[PDB]
């Protein structure tokens, strides 16, 4: 399951958000 | 959205946090 973004976006979201996950629009 | 903002460029850890649930 390789990554799409040069920034390693998906893997960085697992670290920041953990297990509650993320949505595509920021809240602030 | 997050793909348009944080995929070509690295986004801060503060910035990524604003996208969490």
């Amino acid at each position, epitope marked *: 399951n390789q990554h799409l973004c040069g920034s390693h976006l998906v893997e960085a979201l697992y670290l920041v958000c953990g297990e509650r996950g993320f949505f595509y629009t920021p*809240k602030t | *959205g997050i793909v348009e903002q944080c995929c070509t460029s690295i986004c801060s850890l503060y910035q990524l946090e604003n996208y969490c649930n």
Partner: antibody, heavy 117, light 107 residues
């Protein structure tokens, strides 16, 4: 001024299809994530579909996932919702809504859908 | 996707008076709560975001407050065009609406 104008609502038989349109003006449409939200006859607001500003990302609740498809044409400042295999629980007023941040900040005036035999 | 319990379902108030609505979240929502006004035949209109920050152009007689799980919305000096249905929306974890509060005129 910011304007959103929905159109295409009508009466559809159960199992039918219908494509809704939303016309945007008064702002840079391609910078904004957009959603469709519906109000049911019992006056509940229901998030129906979401698409990110460049169209890369999409989200649907399980109640419509697989039957609805949201899409956009940024050169024509238009948002669309293609609905299919329609059911009576889909009957509602359907609104277009802009998401600069995650909370909605502008809505259209709505277009009405009725699903009935 | 958190459950918002809005109450009361309906209220009656007099011109010049004052009304208060509450929203209770099923879990902590970190002050990411917005409030909308909805009149028959129009689309909803955003009043307040981040619990108490007024949207530009919205009169100052509207206000909100709260933290954690417990929030409230208020109208000072009720004007006749304030008659409407009001909704809350949490947007900390995805997004979800309260059931609404129908505001009518005392007489």
């Amino acid at each position: 001024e910011v304007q959103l104008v929905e159109s295409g609502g009508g009466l559809v038989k159960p199992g039918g299809s219908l494509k809704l349109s939303c016309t945007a003006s008064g702002f840079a449409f391609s910078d904004y994530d957009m959603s469709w939200v519906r109000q049911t006859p019992e006056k509940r607001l229901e998030w129906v579909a979401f698409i990110s500003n460049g169209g890369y990302s999409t989200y649907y609740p399980d109640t419509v996932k697989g039957r609805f498809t949201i899409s956009r044409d940024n050169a024509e400042n238009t948002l669309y919702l293609q609905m299919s295999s329609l059911k009576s629980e889909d009957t509602a007023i359907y609104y277009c809504a802009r998401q600069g941040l995650r909370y909605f900040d502008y809505w259209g005036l709505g277009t009405t859908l009725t699903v009935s035999s | 996707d958190i459950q918002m319990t809005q109450s009361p379902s309906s209220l009656s108030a007099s011109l010049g008076g004052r009304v208060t609505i509450t929203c209770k979240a099923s879990q902590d929502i970190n002050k990411y709560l917005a409030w909308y006004q909805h009149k028959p035949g129009k689309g909803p209109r955003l009043l307040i975001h981040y619990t108490s920050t007024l949207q530009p152009g919205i009169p100052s007689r509207f206000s909100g407050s709260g933290s954690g799980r417990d929030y409230s919305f208020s109208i000072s000096n009720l004007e006749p065009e304030d008659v409407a249905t009001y909704y809350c929306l949490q947007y900390d974890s995805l997004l979800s609406f309260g059931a609404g509060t129908k505001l009518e005129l005392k007489r």
